[PDB]
Every structure is written in structure tokens, then in C-alpha cells.
Design a protein around this ligand. Structure first.
Ligand SMILES: Nc1ncnc2c1ncn2[C@@H]1O[C@H](COP(=O)(O)OP(=O)(O)O)[C@@H](O)[C@H]1O
Ligand SMILES: Nc1ncnc2c1ncn2[C@@H]1O[C@H](COP(=O)(O)OP(=O)(O)O)[C@@H](O)[C@H]1O
Ligand SMILES: Nc1ncnc2c1ncn2[C@@H]1O[C@H](COP(=O)(O)OP(=O)(O)O)[C@@H](O)[C@H]1O
Lengths: 510, 481, 509
């Protein structure tokens, strides 16, 4: 029995760690990398997947958030707190002489009663702009300083609606993330198109083009090697440069057809053309295309060329010998914004690019990466709200209404199984107890307040983080996804089963 | 006696590990790896496999269990527990001042009585009825992911051993390693899995000029001077006009130049066991070399030749409509984790069919088989003339630990139910009044599917007593070579 | 908070010690005095009042059971069990951040709610022979070795019934408890009269007297001082013998004065006379009175003389010169009982003694002291049963029904005190958890069946020790007193209130 007490006391310490960083009133935690980087964050999955823990037992709990993040991406903080309180309450019954296996069946019966109660609390209302604003405010508040709440709320919601229509399945790959320095934190905004890293290097390029055609290519216009069966037949160093022009002759002629393609495809004034060649371009080749006002880009990433096909429509060409106007894309106001450090190209004003870019702005890297965690955590909560139209009220409204149901639940499986239901009910009530401490109010006053509310109809009250009163989470705009709470009842019970089923601990070479 | 007692605590501690790892409510264990990692398995086979032990008497317990894993993929947990519990009775070894030979004769005498007692509670099985076999194999499908396709696992497990069994030789030998080669194919799901009624070779396709789909194939089993033999060894095969050239050893690069010229499939690295299944499938004959081929080395009677790229991987299907003392399983799955679940779980069910087909006799499991045995030896000890009766009764009290763990793992009162469990075997018939592993209370086994085969328990008590005999026959440790 | 954790775990260890001696099926505890005395008992008062504990915090709990035993006389073992569980559950909330002051407010509400619950389930059954046997079975079963139950049950029941009439309240001083050795333990029975330690020792005495007039005296019949203005003055050993002739005139002449009263008051045959003088008597006075059919007793206790006045009715005399017939009593069979070594006087079949004698018999000293406390603990259990006309069911049946009333109860004073009621609910359920272990059965499986028992009626459900099923305590003859549970919940809440409010522990010398 003493061997089981180690895993109980092991996760109890992990409960005391991740209890203060839950919610916006909660604290943050630092990641000392040792190399020179410092990170600040609240999400428990980040505090465990990248972190290394002293105890061996708690390291197994770290992998729970790793598998949990792949399903939902949130709620990992509350998962460990339910697990910590379950085994805390179960220790009081095992101390009297009860076996752990009897308590596990009690949780297995409480899982169905708690899961079946979830069907009643969720609301099948239509998800709209006003509904998701309540959702984004619930998640992003725990990742910012209470100032970027309204700033990032309007960005995450519009990013989702602009990339999904007609019940189309949504995907997170469509939203690109970018970061820029020398700006304030409240200047976060959205981008219609895609922001490119490397721009053009020539003074003769147009700073901004109201309308220009796009041409996708992968041909390097620099001094390349020989293509035909020949070689360097020479007798001195001066003759070497003559055959360099021959290896450039195949390259120089290919750029002359690009000007012909521009002159044939809208070669009149009030027009433009923008090349998006991923490979490098010679300064001489840029000098020839810059005279015609063609803003040619070079040294881009492979990920942007795939996104450029979706936004611009130009098909990738592998050789200029097969240059045809069929593979030409199109873009709106194509420009390059000048910042304090570097220049970056914009292809905004597309009709339907099927890809947006959330341009994040922050002065420091630890602040820029913190918001990057808020984006992917805030985006997935809205992804889970639309892909699963059912949502539930937060503020512990689901846990309290479930906990009230388990006390008024008779044993429908076994006799002694009711004891685990008594323990599983006291575990879910830790969520209003945790947020009571982060808010600074009495831990007990918050519990009986939301519990004393009873009526002859639907009544789901919650915790008021600012006052502590029993407040309705559904009306004030607090909503959680159906899949998030669904995984807590499956993850916390399956994991807590595996910890209580350990009888002895043997060292296998340690 | 210090060496006689050393083998007690050396095995008593090993049995303590897997004492709670028995039954469907088996308790998990925490194994601390040297790199800080933890493995949370519960199977006693893999737990003790990784745990390094210092005593030699405990190391023999691991070598005995591995041989049990090849015969039957389950029950090995109780093999060490009975051998550990039989040796845990130190009152008769040292305190009573008996010789080890006194107790070895007592256990060997009790061995012949336990064997006859288990056959008295036996029951025949009608293997023709697939529904009656479903109740037997479901003991392993329960508490698994394959419960969603239990009927499919029953058809795959039961019909596969029927193809390996050859009942014309009298012995009715069943070998899973040679005649039940289990292979995987990417793509599909567990529902898409089926049993191929023939041979399948896992040879990938190297050249494009090869016969893709042929309904009536033909199988053939087997600079200047260098290409002399290469062109001649290849030209002797096309005299029969085959469609797939199956070679034992590897084929050279220039010999394949004529195999791709003929636009025929080129197979190599084939075992001797694999070619005999083909020779019995399509009636071909295995020739020593390619130069002495005859007319009989053809593929008349074969089903089809298909090297289609299924799941981004080629697979040579040379199946037929016959069962040439062999079979081949086709496991389909969307991922490797799902494939790894069905591949290992069917091996636990496939070995149960091996025990029933060799001897269709079952026994009442769930603690019912032990009490049926322990009740027979207790009454026989009161009339057994000799000093061996005292250790003869210790076996009656020692085999009660198997149901003791099932009730203790459930958490119920093991002392109250086990004492009353004796009365059910004392008054009523011993073939019933078992113990429910999930519930914990007493229930008859005729109404439940806890029936285990006969070969599983025979090898258990034979190896459980033989292990205690080999450990009590030791009296000193010799160091040297 | 640390000042409570030392007191919290101090009671938890004390809970694991005394939990194995609750009920008959539990174990016993040994008392090592160090001087040579060894004692065995299950009553928690003796395990705490006479025992020395190492911790000072646990020493205060010992004084609670000391006063608890003085009021009700039983239930002190479960009093400490609830206390140890009250602070156990209070520590679960103290770790979350609740002050102990609010938890005491929750116990105050549940204590008054549970006290109201006793008024509903109590049974005011008529007191008679058959019902009190069911009560005395509950008090004495936990003080013996499962054999003296039926033996001692009839004793305590008929003892109190003999001294209760005309609506008179009960008094424990109306029972003279004596002990006899050189006999077995199952020979404990009731003696109608009074047993005297020392009696008449002369061959000329009658073995038994069917009827005798008992004369009460306090006169010295041994060598005393001179009663006139004189003294003891002599010159040798022979002259000293002449003073014996003078002093003995005060003793010898008083022997004949009893003979003159014998021939006066019923001097014929078919009669008798018994002198119960408290002082010692000379053998010449024994031989003189033995021939006259007069039984002379000496060396009696001060309290035995008080009961002797009630047995026969003769008033206590101080001088034979003041002798009169008015101070003469009367009794029935007066004889002498014979043990293996000693002999005792028996004056049973009295007229109106108003004082019975519970004669205890046992072979050993340490075993006789175990029954010594069981008598005082058995007599007081039924004493409260008749004085308190209402009784409650035993078998821990009050605790499981009390848990149903308090869970279905909301405080009308505040919200946060509701959790103190939740702790008081699990603290009372420890008794069916303790007895389930002392019986050898599972702790929780026994609690489920007694808690799951429900019906559309008034259903009293308790704990079966022999099988482990739900037992209706009223059907099997298992009952307690109404003042026991009332003093239990009234006492256990005050102590938990006094200890939990200790903020700091200062070393005061
Ligand atoms: N002020 C609040 N009001 C209501 N609910 C809150 C509040 N703060 C946090 N929560 C709840 O805490 C839960 C977890 O939030 P968060 O820590 O951001 O995600 P995770 O716990 O998955 O990392 C949310 O489901 C939310 O309902
Ligand atoms: N459903 C069940 N009810 C009762 N007992 C069972 C049940 N299933 C298995 N058992 C018992 O558990 C023991 C171990 O079974 P198994 O797990 O197949 O072997 P091992 O534990 O060696 O892997 C068997 O002896 C059997 O009596
Ligand atoms: N055999 C039994 N089964 C169930 N309950 C019992 C049994 N014997 C006693 N009890 C209960 O135990 C309690 C304590 O009994 P007792 O031993 O007389 O007091 P104490 O334990 O304080 O000495 C009583 O309230 C009674 O209801």
C-alpha cells in the first residue's frame, strides 16, 4: 500500500503546481532554457511537454497533455487538477482498508452518469459572429494581460469565418502565423493574403502596385551550369568569362520572354506584373525586368509557393521554354511595407485566397511567442465550436451541475461502486474552488453560493471571477466546446484508473 | 538447508510480483527504467522479462516462462505462482526436518492424481459448431479492441488452424510457425481483413516488366563467360513458359535482365518451407537447379498471380482454392498501432484453437478447476499410508491461491467467499460453482464462457510441479567453468 | 495551522488504537502496571483513565471519556472514534483554506438537527422482563468472552427489578456487590439477602436456622479498657491475671444479658437468634452463646451494618445495658455457605430488606476484576433504560438513519456551514465501519447494505455481526438507552469545538 502512496503524493504535488495558473486571475510560469531564451505561458500542456519534471511518476502525467493536445488542444490545466483531487479523495477510502479496484469501477459508473448528463447541458444554438466573440474572450483572457482581449478577439473570429463556408470542413493549415518587432502589442491585425519574407532588392521596383499578374516559377535565373553536352574549352582566364556568357545565354534569353509575356498580357499602362520565383535571380536579370516595372521576388520558402498557388492561382512552371499565359495568377494591391528592420511583400486584396495570415506584433520575443500560443489555443476553441455546433457553459457550470447529479444517483452497476461516485463528485467541484483562490475570494463561499441556486427549470450558475457571486455563465457570454469536457471525463478517469491500479514499484535497472 | 531455503525466497518474491497480475482485473505495475522512464504494462510475461534478478533460482523461472509462451500465449502467470506457492511451504522442508527427496516423491505422486482429476471434470466440444467455439475464444476477445470484430476474429482464428491441421497422418500435428505465417498489408481497416486460402510472398516488385494479373499462372520452383551461364540458367526456365520465377537464393542483376525481357515476375529469397507450400498448392516440384527442370514444375491448379501495389506496397498473391496443409492471414488496418493490436490479439486466440483441435476437452476456469482438484486430494490424503501425506495435503492448500488472487484483485472478502467456496465443492458437484472475475461472487461455469482448454492446464501443472522439483533438487551452488 | 496538525494526527493514531475493542467481536487491551498487576478490558474509560498516554493532547481526550462514563456509563469508545474522524474530515477542508470557526458552526447545526432526529426514531416501549433482557444483552456482551452473556443477563435484569417499586428512582447503593474465589466463573447468581465476610466459627453452632430474630449490636466483646474509675495496675504476671478477672466483668456479664433476651423474646423451640455485632467477640462469649442456639457474628463492614438494619429491622444498639426488645429484627433462612477454603454467612429470605446482593464468582483475580467492571457497566446501562422511558435501536442503527436526515438538510443560518454537516455525516458512519472490521468482514461492504436499505415506511436498519447483512435491531432484541446517544452528540461536538479553535500551542512550563 505504501508503494501506491508514492504515486498519490507524486501527483498531489503536481496538483499544487498547476492550480494557480488556471484562468485570467491565475499566475504565469517561466521556462528557463539555460541557453539564453526565456518563455512565459499559462497553458499546462506547454508547462509539461517541453518541461522536464523531477519525479518519475509525474513525468507519466506529462504525456497525458501530449495526447490530450492532439484531440482538443485545451483544458490540460484542469485535467491534472481533477486527477490530483481524485487520487486525493480516494486515499481517504483506501486508508480505511478499501481496495483500489472497487473505487475504479465507481468512476467507471460515474463516467456514464456524468457523460449522459453532458447531453442535457450543451446548447445546439446556431453559431454566429456574436456567439464566437463570447468564445474567443473565454480562451484568450488566460494568455494576455487583460488588454489584448478585445484586440485579438476580433482577429481570431474573423480568421475562421473567412476560410470556411457552406459547411466545408475547416483546417488549421489555412491560417499562417507571422511576427514582427519594433511595434506595440495592441497592433495585432489580419492580412487578406500572404506576407512573404524576402522581397526585391532594386530601387527601380514599384513600391506598391494596385493590380498585377502573378507567375509561379521554379527556374533559377542566376549563373547556372551547362545544360547541353559541352564544356569549358579555353586557353586563358579571359576566355573563361566568354563561356560564362554562354552558360548565361540560355538564362538571359529566358528572361526576354518574360517581358514578352508582360507585353502580350496587358502591356498597356495602368497595369503591373509580379514574379514570385522561389529560386534566386541575378542582379542583371532583375535589372532587365525592373525597367518594365516588374516587381520580381526571390529567395522565398517552399511553403509560400504552395500557398501562392491557392491565393494567386498561377501554376508552377519548371522551364521558361514552355512559357505560356495559362499559368498566370492574379493579385490585388501588391506592395511591400517598410518596417524598422526589413521589408516584406503583401499580396492582399484577393477575391478568395483560401488562406489568411494573422500578423502578430510585439516588441519582445517572449511576448511574441506568448501571443503565438494564444492564437493556436484560441483558434482551436473556435474550430471546435463550429465543427461541433454543441457548446456548454463554462465557469464550472458543467462540473457543478454534474456533481449535483452524482450525489442524487443510485448504484446502477454494483453496491460499493457508489463510493467512487462520491469521490468523483468531490473532484469535479475543485474547478470552482481553484478559481476562487486565483480571484482571491474565499474558497468555500464560492462553492455553496453556486450550489444553493435551485429552481423548477434549467438553472446553470457559475463563478463570478470579479465579485464571487453565483453568476450565469450562459448569459454573460462564457461557452466551452462539447469535445473539451467530453475528453476530461475520459482522460481523467482512464488515467486515474492506471495510477490506482499500481500495487508495487520495482526498479528495472534504475 | 541454507541453499534449500534460498530457492524459496528466490521464487517467493518473483511470485509476489505477478500475484496481483492475474485475471481480467489484473493490476498494473510500475517499472522504473534507468533513463527515468516508466512502463505501465500489466502482463506478467513482459514484466519479469525486463526485470534483472540476481539469484540463479529466480532466473530459471524466466527461462521456464518463455518456453510456455511458445506453447500457449496465456496462463503463464499462474505457472510461476503455483511453482512459487508450492515452494513457499517451508514447514515441510526445514522445520519438519524432511529430506527434499521425501517431498519430491510426494509432489510427483500428487502429479498423477491431479491429471486424472482434471479429466473427470472435462467436457467434449463439437468443433463443427462455430457458435460453440465462439464461447471458448471470447475469453480472450473480451477486454480488447477486437471486441468490435469478435465474429471476424473467430472466423480468422478458428478456420486458420483447420487449414494447418492434417488429420490423415493420425498424429494431427499443428504448427503455427511454419504453416500459419501471419503477415500484414497496409491500407484498409480491421473489417477488410480476411484469411488467404493459400500462399503469399512478401517480395516487393523491382522491375516493371512483370505479369501483373494472371488467372492461370505457371510457377517454377528452383563478361563473355560470365553471361554464358547467366543466359543459359535463365533460358532453361522459359522452356515451360512460366509467369513467376521463384528462386531460393538471390538472383543476379544480369539474370534479371532476361526475367524482365520475358516480362515475368522475379521472386527470390524464399525459404525451403515456403516452396513446399507452393509445390503442394499448385502441384509444382522443387528442383535443385534451373538447368534440370522437367514438365511437372508448372503451376496447374493455381488460383491467380497478383503482385498489385496494395497500400503502397506490393504483395505476391499466389493463392489457390485448396488448403495444402498451410494458410496465410491478411491483416488490414489504417495504422500500425491498430495492426499491432489485431496481430497480437489473434495470436492469443489462435493458440486456444490449437488446444481444442488437438484435444476437444475443456475445464471450468475462474477458480473452479483448482477447487475441483484440491477437494479430490484432501480426502485422498486421509487414506494415503505414508509420511508423504503431509506434503500431499500442502498441495491441496497451496492451489487455493489462484482463486484467492481473483477475489483479492476484485477487492471482495476473499476469506469469506473462499471458505464458502469449499462447501460448494464439498456438497454439490465440482464441475460448477466457480468464481466471477468481474463481479467477485460465486457463479456456475456452465452458464459462463470461462472454460479453458485441456492442454493449457496440463502443461501448467506439469511445468509448475517440475519447476518445484528442479529447484528442490538443488542443495549447493557451484561456481566455475 | 501547524498547531492543529499535531492535534489532528494525535487523534488519528488514537483512533487506530481503540477501534479494535468496540463490540464483542473486537479484541482486548492489556494494562501493564509494572508492579505485578495485569488487567484486560474493552471499556475505553479504563483504557484512558487508568492508562498513561505519551502525548498531552491525547491526555485531554482521556478526561472526556472519564466524565462521559460518569453520566451515561457506556459508549465512551465510540465517543473518541467520532472525535478522531471529525478532525480527520476537518483536515480535508483545512487544506483547502477553511477556517475552523465555520466548521464548528456546521457541527452546531447538525448537532441540533440530529438531536431532533432522536426524538423521531426513539421507541417508548414498556419496561418489563423481556425488554430489559434485550438491553442488558447489549451492555454485557462486549465485556465477556461470549459465554457469560445469558448467565449475567438474568442477574442484572432481576437485580434492578427487585429494587424498583412505587415509582421510586433508581439508586446504585441499593446493591451490595461481593466476590468469592475458589469457584468457576459461570456460577455468578443473585443473593436475596446480604453476604457477610466473617461469620460464626464454633462447633456448637447450628448449620442453618429457618427463622431467627436478628439483634443488632455495636458492643465490644473483647478485652477493653476499664469502664469505671480505675486502671490496670499490677506487680507481676500472676497479679495481672487478677485484673483480667476485673476487666472481663464488663464483657462476660454482657453475654448473659443476651441470653436473658433470648428466653424473653421467643425462647421456645422452632425459633432462633442471630447476633450481628460489628466488634470482635471472645471465644468464651462464642461458646456461651453457641450452646443457646444463638449465632454470634463479628468482623463486619461499616456498610454491611447499614444494610443489616434494613434486612431484619432491628435498630443498631451501642450498649447491652441499653438493651431492649424494640431493637429486635426478624429474618428467614439464616445459614452458612461453604467454599473450598473459607465460609460465609447468608441471611437470605428477608422480610423487607430493600437491598439485594449480586454475588460474583470467579477463579482468578484478573478475571474477577473484568467482571467487576462489567457489573457496574451492566447495571448502569439498564438503569438509564428504566429512568429514561424512551430507548433507541442499537446495532449502530441510529448512525445510518442519522446520515439520511443530515444529508437531506440545508442550513437556514448560512451556506459555508453546510460542509461541517457533511463532515459530521461521515464522522458518525465510522461506527459501522469499526464494527465491520472487528467482526472480520469488509469495512465498506457492510456500510453499503445498511445504507442501501430503504422502504416506504419507518425502517430501522442496523449491522449484523454474525453474517454482515442489514439487521433490524428491534427484531433481534438490540437496544440502547436514549440518554447515551443524546449525551454522545452533545459531548462530541463540544470537544471538537474546543480543540479545533486552538490557534497556537505555547509551552507553559
Ligand atoms: N473568468 C472565467 N469565467 C468562466 N470560466 C473560466 C474563467 N477563466 C477560466 N475559465 C475556465 O477555465 C477553463 C480552462 O481555461 P484555459 O486554462 O485557458 O484552458 P486549459 O485549461 O485547457 O489550458 C475554460 O474551459 C474556462 O471555462
Ligand atoms: N472472466 C473471468 N472470470 C474469472 N476468472 C477469469 C476470467 N478470465 C480469466 N480468469 C482467470 O485468470 C487467470 C489468468 O488468465 P490469463 O490472463 O489468460 O493468463 P495469464 O494471467 O497467465 O496471462 C486464469 O487462470 C483464469 O482462471
Ligand atoms: N454484536 C454487535 N453488532 C452490532 N453492533 C453492536 C454489537 N455489539 C454492540 N454494538 C453497538 O456498539 C455500541 C457500543 O457498545 P458497548 O461495547 O456496550 O459500548 P463501548 O463500545 O463504549 O464499550 C453500541 O451502541 C451498540 O449499538
Amino acid at each position: 500500500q505504501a508503494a501506491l502512496a508514492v504515486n498519490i503524493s507524486a501527483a498531489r504535488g503536481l496538483q499544487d503546481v498547476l492550480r494557480t495558473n488556471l484562468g485570467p486571475k491565475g499566475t504565469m510560469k517561466m521556462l528557463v532554457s539555460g541557453a539564453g531564451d526565456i518563455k512565459l505561458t499559462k497553458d499546462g500542456n506547454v508547462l509539461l511537454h517541453e518541461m522536464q519534471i523531477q519525479h518519475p511518476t509525474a513525468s507519466l502525467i506529462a504525456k497525458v497533455a501530449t495526447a490530450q493536445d492532439d484531440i482538443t488542444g485545451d483544458g490540460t490545466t484542469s485535467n491534472v487538477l481533477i486527477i490530483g483531487e481524485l487520487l486525493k479523495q480516494a486515499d481517504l477510502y483506501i486508508s480505511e482498508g478499501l481496495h483500489p479496484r472497487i473505487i475504479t469501477e465507481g468512476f467507471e459508473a460515474a463516467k456514464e452518469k456524468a457523460l449522459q448528463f453532458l447531453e442535457e447541458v450543451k446548447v445546439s444554438r446556431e453559431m454566429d459572429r456574436e456567439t464566437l466573440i463570447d468564445v474567443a474572450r473565454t480562451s484568450l483572457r488566460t494568455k494576455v494581460h487583460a488588454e489584448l482581449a478585445d484586440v485579438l478577439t476580433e482577429a481570431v473570429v474573423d480568421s475562421i469565418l473567412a476560410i470556411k463556408k457552406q459547411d466545408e470542413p475547416i483546417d488549421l493549415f489555412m491560417i499562417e502565423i507571422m511576427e514582427m518587432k519594433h511595434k506595440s502589442e495592441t497592433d495585432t491585425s489580419l492580412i487578406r493574403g500572404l506576407v512573404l519574407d524576402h522581397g526585391a532588392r532594386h530601387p527601380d521596383m514599384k513600391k506598391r502596385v494596385e493590380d498585377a499578374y502573378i507567375l509561379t516559377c521554379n527556374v533559377s535565373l542566376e549563373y547556372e551550369k551547362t545544360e547541353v553536352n559541352s564544356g569549358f574549352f579555353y586557353k586563358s582566364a579571359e576566355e573563361r568569362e566568354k563561356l560564362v556568357k554562354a552558360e548565361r545565354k540560355f538564362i538571359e534569353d529566358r528572361v526576354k520572354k518574360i517581358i514578352e509575356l508582360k507585353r502580350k498580357v496587358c502591356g498597356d499602362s495602368d497595369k503591373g506584373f509580379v514574379v514570385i520565383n522561389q529560386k534566386g535571380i541575378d542582379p542583371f536579370s532583375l535589372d532587365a525586368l525592373s525597367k518594365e516595372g516588374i516587381v520580381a521576388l526571390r529567395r522565398a520558402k517552399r511553403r509560400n509557393m504552395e500557398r501562392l498557388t491557392l491565393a494567386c492561382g498561377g501554376v508552377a512552371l519548371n522551364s521558361f521554354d514552355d512559357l505560356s499565359p495559362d499559368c498566370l495568377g492574379h493579385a490585388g494591391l501588391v506592395y511591400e511595407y517598410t518596417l524598422g528592420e526589413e521589408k516584406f511583400t503583401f499580396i492582399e486584396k484577393c477575391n478568395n485566397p483560401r488562406s489568411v495570415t494573422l500578423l502578430i506584433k510585439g516588441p519582445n520575443k517572449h511576448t511574441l511567442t506568448q501571443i503565438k500560443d494564444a492564437v493556436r489555443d484560441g483558434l482551436r476553441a473556435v474550430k471546435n465550436a463550429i465543427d461541433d455546433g454543441c457548446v456548454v457553459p463554462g465557469a464550472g457550470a458543467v462540473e457543478v451541475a454534474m456533481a449535483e447529479a452524482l450525489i442524487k444517483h443510485k448504484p446502477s452497476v454494483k453496491g460499493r461502486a457508489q463510493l467512487g461516485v462520491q469521490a468523483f463528485a468531490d473532484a469535479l467541484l475543485i474547478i470552482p474552488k481553484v478559481l476562487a483562490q486565483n480571484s482571491g475570494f474565499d474558497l468555500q463561499e464560492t462553492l455553496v453560493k453556486i450550489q444553493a441556486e435551485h429552481s423548477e427549470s434549467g438553472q446553470l450558475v457559475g463563478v463570478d471571477l470579479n465579485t464571487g457571486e453565483p453568476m450565469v455563465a450562459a448569459e454573460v457570454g462564457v461557452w466551452d466546446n462539447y469535445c473539451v469536457k467530453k475528453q476530461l471525463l475520459h482522460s481523467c478517469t482512464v488515467i486515474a484508473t492506471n495510477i490506482l491500479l499500481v500495487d508495487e514499484i520495482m526498479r528495472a535497472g534504475m | 538447508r541454507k541453499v534449500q531455503s534460498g530457492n524459496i525466497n528466490a521464487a517467493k518474491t518473483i511470485a509476489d510480483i505477478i500475484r496481483t497480475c492475474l485475471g481480467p482485473k489484473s493490476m498494473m505495475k510500475m517499472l522504473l527504467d534507468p533513463m527515468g522512464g516508466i512502463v505501465m504494462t500489466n502482463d506478467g510475461n513482459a514484466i519479469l522479462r525486463e526485470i534483472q534478478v540476481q539469484h540463479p533460482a529466480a532466473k530459471s523461472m524466466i527461462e521456464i516462462s518463455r518456453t510456455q509462451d511458445e506453447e500457449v500465449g496465456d496462463g503463464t502467470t499462474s505457472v510461476i505462482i503455483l511453482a512459487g506457492e508450492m515452494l513457499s511451504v517451508a514447514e515441510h522442508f526445514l522445520e519438519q526436518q524432511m529430506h527434499p527427496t521425501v517431498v519430491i516423491s510426494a509432489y510427483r505422486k500428487a502429479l498423477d492424481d491431479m491429471i486424472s482429476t482434471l479429466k473427470k471434470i472435462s467436457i467434449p466440444v463439437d468443433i463443427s459448431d462455430s457458435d460453440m467455439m465462439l464461447n471458448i475464444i471470447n475469453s480472450s476477445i473480451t477486454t480488447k479492441a477486437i471486441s468490435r470484430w469478435s465474429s471476424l476474429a473467430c472466423n480468422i482464428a478458428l478456420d486458420a488452424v483447420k487449414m494447418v491441421q492434417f488429420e490423415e497422418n493420425g498424429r494431427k500435428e499443428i504448427d503455427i510457425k511454419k504453416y500459419a505465417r501471419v503477415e500484414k498489408i497496409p491500407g484498409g481497416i480491421i473489417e477488410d481483413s480476411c484469411v488467404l486460402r493459400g500462399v503469399m510472398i512478401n517480395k516487393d516488385v523491382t522491375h516493371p516488366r512483370m505479369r501483373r494479373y494472371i488467372k492461370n499462372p505457371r510457377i517454377v520452383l528452383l563478361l563473355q563467360m560470365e553471361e554464358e551461364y547467366i543466359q543459359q540458367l535463365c533460358e532453361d526456365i522459359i522452356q515451360l513458359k512460366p509467369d513467376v520465377v521463384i528462386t531460393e537464393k538471390g538472383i543476379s542483376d544480369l539474370a534479371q535482365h532476361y526475367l524482365m525481357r520475358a516480362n515475368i515476375t522475379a521472386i527470390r529469397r524464399v525459404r525451403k518451407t515456403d516452396n513446399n507450400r507452393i509445390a503442394r498448392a499448385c502441384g509444382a516440384r522443387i528442383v535443385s537447379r534451373p538447368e534440370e527442370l522437367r514438365e511437372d514444375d508448372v503451376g496447374t491448379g493455381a488460383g491467380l498471380l497478383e503482385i498489385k501495389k496494395i497500400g503502397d506496397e506490393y504483395f505476391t498473391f499466389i493463392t489457390d482454392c485448396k488448403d495444402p496443409k498451410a494458410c496465410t492471414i491478411l491483416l488490414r488496418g489504417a495504422s500500425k498501432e491498430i495492426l499491432s493490436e489485431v496481430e497480437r490479439n489473434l495470436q492469443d486466440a489462435m493458440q486456444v484453437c490449437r488446444n481444442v483441435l488437438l484435444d476437444p476437452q475443456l475445464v471450468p476456469g475462474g477458480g473452479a478447476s483448482e477447487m475441483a482438484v484440491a477437494h479430490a486430494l484432501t480426502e485422498k490424503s486421509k487414506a494415503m499410508t505414508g509420511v508423504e501425506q503431509w506434503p500431499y495435503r500442502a498441495v491441496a492448500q497451496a492451489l487455493e491461491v489462484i482463486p484467492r488472487t481473483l477475489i483479492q484483485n476484485c477487492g471482495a472478502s476473499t476469506i469469506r467467499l473462499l471458505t464458502s467456496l469449499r462447501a460448494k465443492h464439498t456438497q454439490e458437484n465440482c464441475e460448477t460453482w466457480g468464481v466471477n472475475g468481474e463481479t467477485g461472487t460465486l457463479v456456475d461455469m456452465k452458464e459462463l464462457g470461462i472454460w479453458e482448454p485441456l492442454a493449457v492446464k496440463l502443461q501448467t501443472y506439469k511445468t509448475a510441479v517440475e519447476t518445484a522439483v528442479l529447484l528442490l533438487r538443488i542443495d549447493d551452488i557451484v561456481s566455475g567453468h
